[PDB]
Design a protein around this ligand. Structure first.
Ligand SMILES: [Mg+2]
Lengths: 582, 757, 124, 283
DNA sequence: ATGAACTTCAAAAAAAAAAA
């Protein structure tokens, strides 16, 4: 199902007119297309480049498929009419001649044996007269932009004769048919059966085709080539007898999705997501749709793309799915492709890890809270960072919190450590440090990494007995009383006592609570002083002694307890109510 | 109650816009706003556009924020959208919810950015509150009929044979325009105190800058036709009339999608309007839109159109937008937020960007594009990067929106017929475009302003100092090199013998227009009398933007015929020269940096070396250039035609991405950053101020002559918000790339009188 | 949340100060500067400093208590606390520093829980 | 550079004051909480030694890497404006900068300094490493609430004319902090920290409290500086088998201390002379 | 001759909230 779900959208995108390589071809990224006249005579070396900031090498021309050269005598293979600045010009940037001239001795051979088998084309007779020139090819090096194709190793030049103007020599409706004939005769006399993917006879394809976009080089996604990965003496592709017509389909299915908008990194794991076979598009809804509705394979991938993007957008919505999205989360090994994810499941089922991420991360917010309901990871991790989210450690943090969030894994200790660092370093617990600590501690509980404690809740737990959480609440009420006593404070007992009330409660809370009677005295509403003192009595009723030192477990609680109680105090009528029910 | 809009009256009173009549009037207004398209369909979003305004909370915020009966920012757009999605249909509901929940937050995506799927699922509580408000006091239960069976009519009255998915987004934006126009025209009919828009309340001439539409045609365009034809009868006006005699015969035929193939000086700006207002009167077209790639031809058409039609010509530079005030702007400029004027002339980056917009403000116009005649002058600069979305939407608009896109560029945009590579229809473009010129090719030969000389077909490249000597040999040489750095190199290669004038994007738009104005009067001295000092102008694509320069001879770097045509337009502009001007293309050093520019040369080169470009100003060679050009970059850049293809599934029907396909829809690819380098433009020394932008060419250079001794200062950047005075800043920026910044540490005032650093 | 038999001198002094201020704040409830507002800072740290004076000051609050039996109520729990206080410590230990605030608010809760003192007294 | 390795016990006391306020804890003195014993950061005594050297030396080769308007990258960039502007080849440019910052700044030559910051000046460990100073007995931080008859910005000014901002003055009624320190020879070789700089440091340790007085410190003194000078660059004896020779206890019958006369500082120089000196520099 | 050693292959890939 890993590949029959790729074959079964090649057969969908090839039938949704989405423009996928048709049965013999490949959307190869040809950077430095060659222009020739009708009888040779190199005209121009156009570069079909200029895309995303790393100038990806060429407009994807859907040219005859890359033949997977890959060998010591790699020169013999010679892709049909597009290959290489070493195959087209015999120019070796770093490979040396006789490893580029023998390439050109075979690329010219390939073109010519095409020309004999495909005459009166004026496109291949042109290039076959351009590949029997040795001078116009020399003129290719003396081109205006040749110096920029020599810069890109493995440049793929291809032969657009002039007077076709978009259509390559390998695009004419004879080379197009030749490839549709050279992938229907030569790749049909091979090992007769039987398909792994489709199950049909469909002659077996040894050498699956170089799935591009995963690795540093197009690597054969399914490729058993070492002395023992071969199971039954099957030798490299008969270990997995996938037909040529099916091998091509899923290879060019990955190739487009790793080159399309389907590709997106879940985290450090480039993933191709495509909608499964959509339901028959119930009649009423299909009444308005013309055709009617078509199963565009990559249609609602956004639902899943904007699910993992929701972890950074903070725009997570609990989804109701039943629209199943294939999500093949491949990743490079070295030059194999490691399927790290495979999910035919719905986006609702995929969300169960981000939902648990944004439910373990749920934290109290008052009214008109400037904080998002589900707080974006970059803005969430920005509460761990020095002052702006780029220095949060790209290996135990932003790159691992995401893996701990995308997968409902345990948030690393490096959050308590980092979130606590910032709690007592910014001298305040931003929503985002309280929320992130709530997520850490909830998952530490759920993993049995935080044994005695019970999972935190959104709200303040006017309970919880936790010698760190209740002192966090105590600090929250103490600082609320101070900020209620002195509205404009320059050094709240946060900014002055937090670093040691969080981590060392006897050092401080024995002296915060001498400031406390004075703060209560200064409350202009003495009844408000009574209410706040009542709740600090309630808070401190759960406390039997300020601990000498708060474990890393509880300084997270302190921060969570602080934020819980401080958003309880800044609730509409919470303290007035809770006081009035006593 | 319920208080749709709380306007603190100018008399320190407070008037309440009753949400009853607010929704009723908006629906009625955006029932006429849509024609056969969404007449009763857009109203069902007009009825609902501010349903959430019924929120018991919002009826505590609009009071709190607007000071009615004495700060939370309560959402209200989503509630009407959720109401729609639950009541009408999963299709029609989401269709209508795009409009509704976007009506203030801008058109939203279903998934990616500002996702509707999120907002609706989170609108359940908000919809409960707002619907409780709706039912609580007033508003008879059959006030929101949302009659899907009746609403199925105007959907199927327009979507004959079902809803095309790949262009269902155009309603989602056009009917969105109907809603946002109606709500804005009604909120600001109450933010100004008229309590109505469609009626004489905001139809009063003091409200929204009314302008004559069809009566003015017979008066004033016929006036300037007669007063221009009777002026002269020479080698011109015998073909200018030959243009605007078939441009007038072309208005009869239906052919909803047209194109004007007229070269420079052939009544391009006078017959494009001429065809439009004859095809506007005929085919019930209520508006004429005239779109320009750059805000330079915008001036040359503002002047011409006002000289034709007085003051009706409404405009938005979108870059300059000069800062004159007091009801000449901000009254007529209040009529161009939505183009509710018969003759709107702006750029096809405030047309198409807005015509493909999602933002609430930008989207108010697709109303007025539909059932108009959009004219695209210099349309050959419609970005091939965004050529597929632009051409599909203009094709759809032509097909069923009653528009007539006019491609009144010099050569043509080959905006596709079906440029299909294998079987797939790449850029499924405009079907059967009529060249309103009877003979496209021979007329460009008949109206050939300049004979052109390409570089030798071999690969030899003329050197920078070589072409410096070449242009030193003849006077008044425009020299348009491809890069700003090529402009610096050419300016660093010219002798001090003659005046060398540098013009690259390393300069400021006001300083730019100053340079063009002084070049214009230098040319005038060359014609009327003579300038003994040699004249030339080192330039980049800036002169390529239709600036009125009559250069006898133009050497232009090796790049696209699109740009070669523009260079030729600056050579022998308006004629009055001897037999022909002389434009020569030089294959400069390394050329055409990257992007569309490098593909520009790689096409123009690949023709002259291959037997094409026999006359590389003929339209047949130009269409060949564009035919090559489209199909050489991705004719659809980032995704846009795929983003807006409606993508209907039973669970998430009609999941168009809009703020994804508006944010990614950037015609101006302003890659990098924009630095403002203060070049003191000029001053009248009459308590000066006066950036003097559009009278630079006339007022300054008639009082103070061309002797390069002008002294005047105008300092800006008061560092105040002021909500205005913004076009003294980035009216004067320059746009280095991100590569040129870390090699500069800011080092202000380093931008010289010829360019920046 | 009150360990009436804690014996932690900080905690028993906190309890003692809580009842002392309870009496002061029942002696005259309208009080600008209760002994929390004027004495707590050292009662929590230097119990010998105040707690001597706090009990010069205590019988007079017990007199000022309007409900003469409420005075017995509160004096009884002062004695209940002071059984656990063999001496007012010179300087409260840091553990005891914090436990004094613990005691203040534990015993303050115990006093402001409705029937607790009146009940717990009646089991003596 | 020095050719002996030193391990010193620096007993310094505070009589009525805040030896080292914990910014994490208001300003109340740093305290080992679970034992109540006070703490005085190593950086605190390094600071007062810095203040002493900045006080007395007043000359180049003994600067301090310094007081408030002490943007450290300014001094570091001064290092890169030296003989090693270009001639030291960025790799060892930072090492030549270290050698400079060590030459000029006695702070850097003696204690280390993280100067990798501006025009990177390397990373000096510093031969002299004071430890934290844990008071022998629990400091009974008094936290003397004080008063000011004046306020600050007219936002905390009283709604009547009576301005006052009582504030708090934490004092240790007595604490005999004990700072173990290590003059490591291996890093004296790195910084050029010499026996002259070391005698400066011993003077600084003895006299660093006679000069760094505050309303906060009240009265701090240097009750003893017992320096164990090993024969080798290496350690003749383990450092803590030496520090246990300076046993500081509260005397026989003091419930808790109130002066150095309440501590017996028994120095056991009986057998350390294996190859090694004990010099009672301060006590 | 079989299986390690080696030689070719190919030339990455990049994001991320408002708020009506
Ligand atoms: Mg509204």
């Amino acid at each position: 199902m890993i590949l029959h779900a790729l074959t079964q959208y090649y057969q969908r995108k090839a039938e949704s007119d989405g423009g996928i390589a048709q049965e013999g071809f490949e959307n190869k990224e040809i950077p430095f297309i060659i222009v020739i006249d009708k009888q040779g005579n190199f005209i121009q070396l156009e570069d079909t480049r200029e895309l995303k900031v790393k100038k990806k090498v060429g407009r994807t021309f859907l040219v005859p498929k890359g033949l997977g050269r890959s060998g010591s005598k790699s020169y013999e293979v010679s892709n049909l009419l597009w290959d290489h600045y070493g195959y087209v010009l015999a120019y070796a940037g770093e490979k040396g001649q006789e490893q580029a001239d023998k390439q050109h001795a075979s690329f010219t051979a390939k073109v010519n044996e095409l020309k004999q088998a495909l005459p009166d084309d004026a496109g291949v007779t042109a290039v076959a007269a351009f590949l029997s020139s040795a001078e116009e090819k020399s003129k290719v090096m003396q081109a205006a932009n040749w110096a920029e194709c020599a810069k890109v190793k493995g440049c793929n030049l291809s032969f657009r004769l002039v007077d076709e103007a978009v259509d390559l020599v390998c695009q004419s409706k004879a080379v197009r048919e030749y490839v549709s004939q050279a992938n229907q005769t030569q790749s049909d006399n091979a090992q007769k059966g039987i398909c792994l993917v489709t199950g049909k006879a469909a002659p077996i394809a040894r050498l699956h085709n170089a799935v591009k976009g995963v690795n540093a080089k197009p690597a054969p996604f399914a490729s058993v080539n070492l002395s023992a990965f071969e199971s039954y003496g099957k030798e490299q592709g008969f270990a997995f007898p996938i037909g040529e017509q099916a091998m091509f389909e899923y290879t060019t299915a990955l190739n487009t999705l790793l080159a399309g908008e389907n590709r997106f990194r879940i985290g450090d794991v480039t993933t191709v997501c495509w909608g499964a076979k959509r339901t028959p598009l119930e009649e009423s809804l299909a009444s308005m749709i013309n055709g009617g509705g078509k199963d565009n394979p990559d249609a609602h991938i956004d639902a899943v793309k904007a699910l993992y993007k929701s972890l950074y957008n903070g725009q997570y919505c609990k989804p109701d799915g039943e629209d199943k999205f294939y999500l093949l989360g491949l990743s490079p090994n070295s030059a194999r492709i490691v399927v790290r994810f495979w999910h035919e499941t719905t986006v609702a089922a995929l969300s169960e890890s981000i939902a648990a991420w944004y439910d373990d991360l749920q934290m109290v917010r008052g009214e008109n809270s400037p904080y998002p309901e589900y707080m974006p990871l970059p803005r969430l991790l920005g509460n761990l960072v020095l002052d702006g989210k780029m220095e949060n450690l790209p290996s135990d943090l932003i790159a691992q919190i995401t893996d701990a969030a995308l997968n409902n894994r345990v948030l690393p200790v490096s959050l308590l450590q980092a979130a606590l660092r910032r709690n007592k370093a910014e001298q305040k617990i931003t929503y985002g440090r309280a929320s992130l600590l709530k997520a850490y501690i909830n998952r530490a509980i759920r993993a049995g990494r935080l044994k005695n404690m019970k999972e935190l809740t959104m709200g303040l737990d006017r309970n919880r007995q936790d010698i760190g959480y209740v002192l966090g609440r105590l600090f929250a009420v103490l600082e609320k009383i101070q900020a209620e006593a002195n509205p404009g404070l320059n050094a709240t007992i946060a900014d002055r006592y937090f670093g040691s009330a969080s981590s060392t409660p006897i050092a401080v809370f024995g002296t915060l609570m001498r400031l406390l009677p004075h703060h209560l005295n200064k409350l202009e509403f003495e009844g408000r002083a009574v209410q706040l003192q009542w709740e600090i009595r309630q808070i401190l009723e759960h406390c039997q002694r300020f601990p000498n030192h708060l474990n890393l477990e509880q300084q997270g609680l302190f921060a969570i307890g602080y934020y819980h109680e401080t958003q309880f105090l800044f609730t509409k009528d919470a303290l007035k109510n809770l006081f009035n029910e006593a | 109650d319920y208080i749709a809009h709380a306007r603190q009256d100018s008399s320190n009173a407070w008037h309440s816009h009753p949400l009853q009549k607010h929704l009723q009037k908006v629906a009625q207004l955006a029932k006429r706003f849509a024609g056969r398209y969404g007449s009763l369909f857009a109203e069902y979003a007009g009825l609902l556009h501010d349903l959430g305004k019924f929120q018991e909370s919002f009826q505590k915020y609009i009071r709190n924020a607007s000071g009615f009966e004495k700060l939370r920012k309560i959402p209200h757009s989503t509630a009407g959208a959720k109401y729609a999605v639950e009541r009408l249909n999963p299709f029609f509901g989401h269709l209508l919810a795009y409009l509704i929940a976007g009506h203030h937050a801008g058109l939203a995506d279903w998934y990616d950015k500002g996702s509707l799927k999120r907002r609706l699922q989170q609108a359940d509580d908000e919809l409960a509150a707002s619907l409780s408000g709706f039912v609580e006091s007033s508003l008879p239960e059959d006030f929101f009929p949302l009659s899907d069976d009746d609403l199925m009519r105007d959907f199927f009255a327009f979507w004959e044979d079902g809803a095309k998915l790949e262009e269902l987004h155009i309603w989602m934006r056009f009917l969105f325009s109907c809603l946002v126009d109606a709500d804005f025209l009604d909120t600001e009919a109450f933010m100004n105190g008229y309590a109505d828009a469609d009626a004489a309340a905001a139809a009063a001439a003091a409200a929204a800058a009314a302008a004559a539409a069809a009566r003015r045609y017979a008066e004033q365009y016929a006036q300037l036709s007669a007063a221009e034809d009777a002026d002269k009868n020479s080698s011109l006006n015998q073909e200018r009339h030959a243009i605007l005699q078939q441009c007038f015969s072309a208005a009869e035929t239906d052919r909803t999608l047209f194109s004007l193939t007229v070269p420079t000086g052939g009544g391009k700006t006078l017959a494009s309007l001429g065809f439009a207002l004859k095809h506007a009167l005929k085919f019930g077209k209520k508006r004429i839109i005239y779109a320009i790639p750059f805000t330079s031809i915008i001036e040359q058409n503002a002047n011409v159109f006002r000289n034709a039609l007085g003051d009706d010509v409404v405009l938005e530079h979108h870059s300059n937008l000069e800062v004159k005030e007091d009801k000449e702007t901000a009254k007529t400029r209040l009529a161009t937020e939505n183009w509710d004027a018969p003759l709107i002339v702006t750029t096809n980056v405030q047309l198409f960007e807005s015509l493909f917009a999602a933002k609430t403000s930008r989207c108010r116009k697709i109303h007025n594009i539909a059932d108009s005649v959009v004219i695209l002058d210099e349309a050959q600069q419609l970005p091939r990067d965004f050529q597929k979305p632009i051409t599909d939407m203009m094709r759809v608009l032509a097909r069923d929106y009653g528009v007539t896109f006019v491609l009144c560029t010099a050569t043509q945009p080959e905006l596709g017929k079906n440029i299909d590579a294998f079987g797939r229809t790449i850029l499924e473009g405009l079907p059967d475009v009529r060249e309103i010129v009877a003979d496209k090719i021979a007329l460009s030969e008949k109206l050939r302003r300049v004979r052109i000389k390409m570089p030798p077909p071999n690969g030899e490249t003329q050197s920078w100092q070589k072409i410096a000597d070449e242009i030193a040999a003849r006077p008044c040489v425009l020299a348009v090199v491809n890069t700003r750095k090529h402009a610096q190199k050419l300016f660093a290669a010219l002798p001090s013998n003659g005046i060398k004038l540098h013009l690259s994007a390393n300069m400021c738009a006001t300083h730019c227009s100053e340079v063009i104005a002084l070049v214009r009067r230098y040319l005038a001295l060359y014609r009327a009398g003579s300038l003994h000092k040699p004249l030339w102008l080192v330039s980049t694509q800036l002169i390529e933007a239709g600036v009125d320069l009559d250069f006898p001879c133009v050497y232009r770097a090796m790049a696209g015929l699109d740009s070669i045509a523009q260079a030729a337009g600056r050579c022998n502009r308006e004629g009055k020269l001897p037999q022909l001007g002389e434009v020569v293309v030089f294959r400069a050093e390394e050329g055409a940096p990257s992007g569309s520019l490098k593909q520009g040369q790689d096409i123009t080169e690949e023709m002259l070396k291959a037997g094409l470009l026999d006359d590389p100003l003929s339209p047949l060679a130009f269409a060949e250039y564009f035919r090559r050009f489209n199909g050489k970059g991705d004719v659809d850049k980032h995704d846009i035609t795929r983003l807006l293809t409606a993508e209907a599934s039973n669970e998430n029907p009609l999941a168009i991405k809009f703020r994804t396909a508006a944010e990614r829809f950037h015609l101006i690819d302003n890659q990098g950053v924009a630095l403002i380098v203060p070049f003191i433009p000029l001053a009248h020394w009459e308590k000066d101020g006066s950036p003097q932008i559009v009278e630079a060419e006339l007022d300054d250079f008639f009082r103070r002559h061309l002797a390069a001794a002008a002294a005047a200062a105008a300092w800006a950047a008061a560092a105040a918000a002021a909500a205005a005075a913004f076009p003294q800043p980035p009216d004067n920026p320059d746009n280095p790339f991100g590569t040129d910044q870390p090699l500069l540490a800011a080092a202000a005032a380093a931008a010289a009188a010829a360019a920046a650093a | 949340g009150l360990d009436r038999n804690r014996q932690d001198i900080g905690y028993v002094l906190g309890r003692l100060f809580a009842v002392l201020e309870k009496i002061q704040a029942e002696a005259n409830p309208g009080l600008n500067a209760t002994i929390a507002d004027r004495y707590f800072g050292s009662a929590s740290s230097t119990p010998i400093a105040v707690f001597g004076t706090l009990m010069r000051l205590l019988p007079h609050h017990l007199n000022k208590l309007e409900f003469e039996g409420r005075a017995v109520q509160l004096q009884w729990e002062i004695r209940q606390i002071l059984e656990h206080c063999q001496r007012f410590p010179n300087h409260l230990n840091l553990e005891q520093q914090g436990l004094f605030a613990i005691g203040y608010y534990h015993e303050t809760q115990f006093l402001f829980t409705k029937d607790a003192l009146k009940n717990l007294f009646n089991e003596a | 550079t020095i050719e002996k390795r030193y391990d010193f016990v620096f007993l310094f006391d505070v009589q009525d004051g805040n030896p080292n306020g914990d910014p994490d804890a208001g300003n109340l003195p740093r305290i080992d909480p679970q034992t109540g014993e006070g703490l005085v950061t190593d950086v605190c005594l390094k600071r007062k030694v810095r203040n002493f050297i900045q006080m007395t030396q007043n000359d180049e080769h003994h600067d301090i890497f310094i007081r408030e308007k002490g943007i450290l990258n300014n001094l570091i960039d001064e290092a890169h404006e030296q003989e090693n502007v270009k001639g030291k080849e960025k790799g060892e440019k930072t090492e030549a900068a270290r050698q400079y910052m060590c030459s000029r700044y006695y702070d850097i030559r003696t204690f280390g300094a993280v100067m990798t910051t501006g025009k990177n000046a390397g990373q000096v460990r510093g031969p002299v490493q004071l430890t934290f100073s844990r008071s022998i007995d629990p400091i009974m931080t008094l936290e003397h609430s004080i008063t000011r008859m004046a306020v600050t910005n007219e936002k905390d000014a009283s709604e009547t004319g009576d301005n006052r901002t009582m504030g708090r003055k934490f004092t240790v009624p007595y604490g005999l902090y004990r700072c173990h320190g290590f003059i490591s020879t291996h890093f004296a070789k790195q910084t050029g920290f010499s026996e002259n700089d070391l005698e400066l440091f011993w003077q600084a340790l003895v006299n660093m409290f006679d000069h760094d007085h505050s309303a906060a410190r009240g009265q701090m003194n240097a009750r003893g500086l017992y320096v164990f000078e090993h024969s080798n660059n290496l350690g003749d004896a383990p450092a803590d088998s030496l520090f246990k020779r300076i046993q500081v206890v509260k005397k026989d019958g003091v419930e808790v201390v109130r002066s150095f006369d309440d501590y017996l500082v028994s120095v056991d120089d009986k057998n350390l002379e294996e190859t090694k000196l004990l010099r009672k520099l301060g006590g």
